[PDB]
Design an enzyme around this catalytic site. Structure first.
Site, PDB file in Angstrom:
ATOM      1  N   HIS A  92       0.855  -1.188   0.000  1.00  0.00           N
ATOM      2  CA  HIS A  92       0.000   0.000   0.000  1.00  0.00           C
ATOM      3  C   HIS A  92       0.888   1.233   0.000  1.00  0.00           C
ATOM      4  O   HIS A  92       2.082   1.143   0.283  1.00  0.00           O
ATOM      5  CB  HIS A  92      -0.856   0.054   1.272  1.00  0.00           C
ATOM      6  CG  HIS A  92      -1.830  -1.077   1.411  1.00  0.00           C
ATOM      7  ND1 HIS A  92      -2.970  -1.184   0.641  1.00  0.00           N
ATOM      8  CD2 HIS A  92      -1.838  -2.149   2.239  1.00  0.00           C
ATOM      9  CE1 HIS A  92      -3.636  -2.271   0.986  1.00  0.00           C
ATOM     10  NE2 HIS A  92      -2.969  -2.877   1.953  1.00  0.00           N
ATOM     11  N   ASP A  95      -1.085   8.819  -1.678  1.00  0.00           N
ATOM     12  CA  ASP A  95      -0.960   9.952  -2.592  1.00  0.00           C
ATOM     13  C   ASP A  95      -1.824  11.067  -1.995  1.00  0.00           C
ATOM     14  O   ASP A  95      -3.032  10.898  -1.854  1.00  0.00           O
ATOM     15  CB  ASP A  95      -1.489   9.526  -3.983  1.00  0.00           C
ATOM     16  CG  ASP A  95      -1.662  10.686  -4.961  1.00  0.00           C
ATOM     17  OD1 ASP A  95      -1.661  11.866  -4.556  1.00  0.00           O
ATOM     18  OD2 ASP A  95      -1.818  10.399  -6.178  1.00  0.00           O
ATOM     19  N   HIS A  97      -3.339  14.576  -2.597  1.00  0.00           N
ATOM     20  CA  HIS A  97      -3.588  15.545  -3.658  1.00  0.00           C
ATOM     21  C   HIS A  97      -3.135  16.946  -3.216  1.00  0.00           C
ATOM     22  O   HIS A  97      -2.989  17.858  -4.030  1.00  0.00           O
ATOM     23  CB  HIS A  97      -5.081  15.592  -4.009  1.00  0.00           C
ATOM     24  CG  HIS A  97      -5.544  14.432  -4.836  1.00  0.00           C
ATOM     25  ND1 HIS A  97      -6.781  14.396  -5.447  1.00  0.00           N
ATOM     26  CD2 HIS A  97      -4.926  13.273  -5.168  1.00  0.00           C
ATOM     27  CE1 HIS A  97      -6.903  13.265  -6.123  1.00  0.00           C
ATOM     28  NE2 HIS A  97      -5.791  12.566  -5.970  1.00  0.00           N
ATOM     29  N   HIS A 132      -5.336   9.226  -1.169  1.00  0.00           N
ATOM     30  CA  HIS A 132      -5.744   7.859  -1.434  1.00  0.00           C
ATOM     31  C   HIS A 132      -4.561   6.980  -1.788  1.00  0.00           C
ATOM     32  O   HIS A 132      -3.498   7.460  -2.217  1.00  0.00           O
ATOM     33  CB  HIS A 132      -6.769   7.831  -2.585  1.00  0.00           C
ATOM     34  CG  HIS A 132      -6.212   8.270  -3.907  1.00  0.00           C
ATOM     35  ND1 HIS A 132      -5.475   7.433  -4.718  1.00  0.00           N
ATOM     36  CD2 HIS A 132      -6.268   9.461  -4.549  1.00  0.00           C
ATOM     37  CE1 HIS A 132      -5.102   8.089  -5.805  1.00  0.00           C
ATOM     38  NE2 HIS A 132      -5.569   9.323  -5.728  1.00  0.00           N
ATOM     39  N   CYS A 133      -4.743   5.687  -1.581  1.00  0.00           N
ATOM     40  CA  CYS A 133      -3.710   4.726  -1.917  1.00  0.00           C
ATOM     41  C   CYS A 133      -3.744   4.581  -3.450  1.00  0.00           C
ATOM     42  O   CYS A 133      -4.799   4.775  -4.087  1.00  0.00           O
ATOM     43  CB  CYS A 133      -4.010   3.402  -1.217  1.00  0.00           C
ATOM     44  SG  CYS A 133      -2.889   2.049  -1.663  1.00  0.00           S
ATOM     45  N   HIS A 142      -7.703  -0.479  -4.934  1.00  0.00           N
ATOM     46  CA  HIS A 142      -7.528  -0.048  -3.549  1.00  0.00           C
ATOM     47  C   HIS A 142      -8.453   1.121  -3.231  1.00  0.00           C
ATOM     48  O   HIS A 142      -9.071   1.173  -2.165  1.00  0.00           O
ATOM     49  CB  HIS A 142      -6.081   0.373  -3.281  1.00  0.00           C
ATOM     50  CG  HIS A 142      -5.127  -0.777  -3.219  1.00  0.00           C
ATOM     51  ND1 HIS A 142      -4.215  -0.935  -2.194  1.00  0.00           N
ATOM     52  CD2 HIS A 142      -4.959  -1.838  -4.044  1.00  0.00           C
ATOM     53  CE1 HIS A 142      -3.529  -2.048  -2.393  1.00  0.00           C
ATOM     54  NE2 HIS A 142      -3.961  -2.614  -3.504  1.00  0.00           N
ATOM     55  N   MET A 147      -9.822   2.756   0.370  1.00  0.00           N
ATOM     56  CA  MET A 147      -8.558   3.317   0.827  1.00  0.00           C
ATOM     57  C   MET A 147      -8.362   4.764   0.375  1.00  0.00           C
ATOM     58  O   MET A 147      -7.528   5.055  -0.472  1.00  0.00           O
ATOM     59  CB  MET A 147      -7.390   2.441   0.353  1.00  0.00           C
ATOM     60  CG  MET A 147      -6.161   2.614   1.218  1.00  0.00           C
ATOM     61  SD  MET A 147      -5.094   1.156   1.222  1.00  0.00           S
ATOM     62  CE  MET A 147      -3.728   1.819   2.175  1.00  0.00           C
ATOM     63  N   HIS A 252     -26.501  17.560  -1.144  1.00  0.00           N
ATOM     64  CA  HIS A 252     -27.656  18.411  -0.898  1.00  0.00           C
ATOM     65  C   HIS A 252     -28.100  18.248   0.566  1.00  0.00           C
ATOM     66  O   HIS A 252     -28.174  17.135   1.072  1.00  0.00           O
ATOM     67  CB  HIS A 252     -28.816  18.000  -1.811  1.00  0.00           C
ATOM     68  CG  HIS A 252     -30.091  18.730  -1.523  1.00  0.00           C
ATOM     69  ND1 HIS A 252     -30.311  20.028  -1.930  1.00  0.00           N
ATOM     70  CD2 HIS A 252     -31.209  18.349  -0.865  1.00  0.00           C
ATOM     71  CE1 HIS A 252     -31.508  20.416  -1.530  1.00  0.00           C
ATOM     72  NE2 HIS A 252     -32.072  19.416  -0.878  1.00  0.00           N
ATOM     73  N   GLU A 276     -28.208  25.068  -3.545  1.00  0.00           N
ATOM     74  CA  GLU A 276     -29.220  24.072  -3.187  1.00  0.00           C
ATOM     75  C   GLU A 276     -28.537  22.703  -3.256  1.00  0.00           C
ATOM     76  O   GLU A 276     -28.658  21.888  -2.344  1.00  0.00           O
ATOM     77  CB  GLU A 276     -30.451  24.112  -4.137  1.00  0.00           C
ATOM     78  CG  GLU A 276     -30.170  23.746  -5.616  1.00  0.00           C
ATOM     79  CD  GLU A 276     -31.392  23.878  -6.541  1.00  0.00           C
ATOM     80  OE1 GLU A 276     -32.458  23.270  -6.270  1.00  0.00           O
ATOM     81  OE2 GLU A 276     -31.271  24.568  -7.583  1.00  0.00           O
ATOM     82  N   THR A 277     -27.785  22.469  -4.325  1.00  0.00           N
ATOM     83  CA  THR A 277     -27.096  21.189  -4.505  1.00  0.00           C
ATOM     84  C   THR A 277     -25.801  21.517  -5.204  1.00  0.00           C
ATOM     85  O   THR A 277     -25.806  22.184  -6.239  1.00  0.00           O
ATOM     86  CB  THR A 277     -27.927  20.229  -5.365  1.00  0.00           C
ATOM     87  OG1 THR A 277     -29.163  19.974  -4.695  1.00  0.00           O
ATOM     88  CG2 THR A 277     -27.179  18.887  -5.572  1.00  0.00           C
ATOM     89  N   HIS A 303     -27.535  13.935  -4.405  1.00  0.00           N
ATOM     90  CA  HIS A 303     -28.849  14.125  -5.021  1.00  0.00           C
ATOM     91  C   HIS A 303     -29.223  13.370  -6.295  1.00  0.00           C
ATOM     92  O   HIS A 303     -30.114  13.807  -7.025  1.00  0.00           O
ATOM     93  CB  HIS A 303     -29.204  15.627  -5.141  1.00  0.00           C
ATOM     94  CG  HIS A 303     -30.673  15.924  -4.950  1.00  0.00           C
ATOM     95  ND1 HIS A 303     -31.638  15.501  -5.841  1.00  0.00           N
ATOM     96  CD2 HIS A 303     -31.330  16.635  -3.997  1.00  0.00           C
ATOM     97  CE1 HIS A 303     -32.824  15.941  -5.454  1.00  0.00           C
ATOM     98  NE2 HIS A 303     -32.666  16.631  -4.339  1.00  0.00           N
TER      99      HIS A 303
HETATM  100  O1  LIG Z   1      -3.526  10.484  -9.915  1.00  0.00           O
HETATM  101  N1  LIG Z   1      -4.223   9.315  -9.478  1.00  0.00           N
HETATM  102  O2  LIG Z   1      -5.051   9.495  -8.362  1.00  0.00           O
HETATM  103  O1  LIG Z   2     -33.231  15.960  -0.097  1.00  0.00           O
HETATM  104  N1  LIG Z   2     -33.763  15.068  -1.058  1.00  0.00           N
HETATM  105  O2  LIG Z   2     -34.149  15.637  -2.263  1.00  0.00           O
HETATM  106 CU   LIG Z   3      -3.791   0.278  -0.625  1.00  0.00          CU
HETATM  107 CU   LIG Z   4     -34.160  17.460  -3.039  1.00  0.00          CU
HETATM  108 CU   LIG Z   5      -5.544  10.913  -7.185  1.00  0.00          CU
END
Ligand SMILES: O=N[O-]
Ligand SMILES: O=N[O-]
Ligand SMILES: [Cu+2]
Ligand SMILES: [Cu+2]
Ligand SMILES: [Cu+2]
Ligand SMILES: O=N[O-]
Ligand SMILES: [Cu+2]
Ligand SMILES: [Cu+2]
Ligand SMILES: [Cu+2]
Lengths: 336, 336, 336
Positions: A92, A95, A97, A132-133, A142, A147, A252, A276-277, A303
């Site tokens: 494992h 990474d 970001h 993330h792995c 993974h 992960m 949402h 809202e979303t 949503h």
């Molecule tokens: O860049 N691969 O998560």
């Molecule tokens: O919050 N459900 O539309």
């Molecule tokens: Cu892993």
């Molecule tokens: Cu909704």
């Molecule tokens: Cu990545």
């Protein structure tokens, strides 16, 4: 900074807490740059993700899915001690970001079972970021085995709105959303395995359909509902960090809004408002700030409602306080 | 405002019109806050969504898919009388993403067949917002059966661009996009059902594939084409409000652009400009403002072209006026 | 301007270069508006898209998938001579999302095998934009057969950040992302056809699943990796133009970031900053600017990691230079 200058910086050991909670931290940095230390043990373990007893062979940072939220400030250094116990079966790595260089640290943290490694990187950009792995040759496997997690690099001066006014939250929650691809047999029943590797071939076939069998928060259907519902009170300001390392999502808060939403998750990009979303693309984290104005239950969902209510992507907030009839009132309750 | 203050406000009853049209309104508010009154009867009805005769047991606010666009101004109160006729068979309610509290009003409007209710909420945030039915335990099924629409909360001073310049449209259209999941038989032919409940189990299986069989505007393939195409003229300013209550969409006006696009649908979030194709996540409404410059036919589509042309998400605009050869000209027409 | 003025503008022919490289251009415009001339011959041809010899009857502008990047400046005119050889079997055309009128030029460029056409349009809006073939009735089939590319309309003054500071790149790459839908027989083997038309029915069936069999950069799995990885040096500023004419994507530079990202692809819309993973909706192009700070291999991928590592959407950057231990360092290399 030189190696000597870094060596002289104060060090602070942080104790991580399990999602959706976040470890103790300060919004406005206390002092100058520091080397913030974290340690996480990787645990390959079975997790039950739905009420039919469906199992996933999780590859969990710190034992949870998602991995815990790490919080530092811009220009602090994050020093992670990552441990892969001999009880695990796979190599494992990690990474970030948020980091710059070597595949986010992935190229410098490949550890086989029985090994550990310590990675240090400068948190030069403010925002929430996925980690993330990503083992060469088995990357998505993974990640969709859970992960992944996220970190938050706060501006040294805390959060601000698009006009520079400070935005200070009372509570913070971290919702990690996970797409799972669980193999089924000829009768439509989900299969179980006694080793992570045994499920590889069958899982890759489901993954290739780009159709998750489950989409959940905090590792399982109902993980953030019922008794594990997140809480708040009318008047409280809450920051909700949400990540998805492999697939798009559209958060949402039903009955509420995202007053300020850093949809791209980056604090130097002005937040959208009155949302809202909102939308968070696979491979990213985002953050929404809201001040609760009404008590009661709130559904917090992805949503695409099929994903939320058929596949598992739904959480609850239980809010205390007084009802505001100016904002909303039932003039005539349901009646014949 | 106090109960007495709200009771003293003027009331204005509005007659709704069927999409893609929008009831009469003023862009800039006339006078102070008002309690704007709307009434909608819910109709569970069979609708045909394609030329082959494919049927859907729709759950329709005001009898249409999408439900009609309600227009108010910020800080007005929207008072909706929602009626569930005794001829229907299911309990329904309404969640306004524009509202604050009780799951958008959903928790206060659950009405069984033979009941009605009146909900009032303060439209505190400007923008276009989705509204949709959401009965606990059968949420996505009602929404993807067409029980959703949108409202527009205009700033009291009308629309403006990101720098304060006023934006005044000449016409407005509301395009509701709907993803349908119609069961098929062993011959690959769409199935018909005597009653709505008969289709539930088969429909949920299709919903779980996250792959709609049809994606349509105004309730049916080709609904906004031919004699029902939308219209404009060279020089005319048009606002196109677009909503999708359950699934992402990416609107594009072929031959044109989104001069100003509130992609998140919120007017306090500055609009993106000169857009070719914008994105509206499932569970949200967006709006694009464009001044036509060329006459002729335009295709307005969801730019996943398979969804547009194979699944049904394509509409047309017929535009009158003089061709502009400076903007575009055929120097050599197709020839040998 | 006047009729004489347009006719008197300088005409300049430009030699195209195949993706990911870009033809000669200047960031800041040189001289006043010009009519920039390009010629592209359409080639229908069989291409191999993966390591198993899987074939696709590509419909390729200028013989490549994606078609080449054309670069002009705002208010220049782009004058394209499009040629469809008698050796081809299908009618084709071109729709420039950067253009105004006649379905982006699509309605004026329908050419049968044995014909050519010349279209001119004024590039009134700055940004990167998709262009794609769109024959009425068979639009998605041509686009998902690879008949699409992008153009870049630079501001006459070159690029700038959100605060008006100049952003000058040292190099630029164009990554065209393509979703392919290749039919399989009952044994799971990809099928091969004698002529493009023979595959139509089988292909549309796969298209309707909305699930691509392959998602690739520059026309094939691994086309931008290994000896064909893109390159840069530490300190170099790179612009990465990315397009997807039919389906959403979410670009990520592993180990890096998008320092400035015009996610909508439009230069008058301020760029998002410090991006981890950006989002480009199907039917659009986006652009990311990054200054490399660390040497080594970088993965540039669509961050739905299944699409990247199982379906083909992964490229590499090979960067030369000095490692920066301040930004990242292995405090303790992997060890027992
Ligand atoms: O860049 N691969 O998560
Ligand atoms: O919050 N459900 O539309
Ligand atoms: Cu892993
Ligand atoms: Cu909704
Ligand atoms: Cu990545
Ligand atoms: O509007 N079809 O690209
Ligand atoms: Cu309903
Ligand atoms: Cu073509
Ligand atoms: Cu197009």
């Amino acid at each position: 900074a030189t190696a000597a200058e870094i060596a002289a910086l104060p060090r602070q050991k942080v104790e991580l807490v399990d999602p959706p909670f976040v470890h103790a931290h300060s919004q406005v940095a206390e002092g100058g740059p520091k080397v913030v230390e974290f340690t996480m043990v990787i645990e390959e373990k079975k997790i039950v993700i739905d009420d039919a007893g469906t199992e996933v062979h999780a590859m969990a940072f710190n034992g949870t899915v998602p991995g815990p939220l790490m919080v530092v400030h811009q220009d602090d250094y994050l020093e992670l001690t990552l441990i892969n116990p001999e009880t695990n079966t796979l190599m494992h790595n990690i990474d970030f970001h948020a980091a710059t260089g070597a595949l986010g640290g992935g190229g410098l943290t490949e550890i086989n079972p029985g090994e550990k490694t310590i990675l240090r990187f400068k948190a030069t950009k403010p925002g929430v970021f996925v980690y993330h792995c990503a083992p060469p040759g088995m990357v998505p496997w993974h990640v969709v085995s859970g992960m992944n997690g996220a970190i938050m690099v706060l501006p040294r001066e805390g959060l601000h709105d698009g006009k520079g006014k400070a935005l200070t939250y009372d509570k913070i929650y971290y919702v990690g959303e996970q797409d799972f691809y669980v193999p089924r047999d000829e009768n439509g029943k989900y299969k179980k395995y006694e080793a992570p590797g045994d499920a590889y071939e069958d899982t890759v076939k489901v993954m290739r359909t780009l159709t998750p069998t489950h989409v959940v928060f905090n590792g399982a259907v109902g993980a953030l509902t019922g008794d594990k519902a997140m809480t708040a009170a009318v008047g409280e300001k809450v920051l909700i960090v949400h990540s998805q390392a492999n697939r798009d999502t559209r958060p949402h808060l039903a009955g509420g809004h995202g007053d300020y939403v850093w949809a791209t998750g980056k604090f130097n990009t002005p937040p959208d408002v009155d949302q809202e979303t909102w939308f968070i693309p696979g491979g990213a984290a985002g953050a929404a700030f809201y001040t609760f104005q009404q008590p009661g239950i709130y559904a917090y969902v992805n949503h695409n409602l099929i994903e939320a209510f058929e596949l598992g992507a739904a959480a609850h907030f239980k809010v205390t306080g007084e009802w505001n009839d100016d904002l909303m009132t039932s003039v005539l309750a349901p009646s014949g």
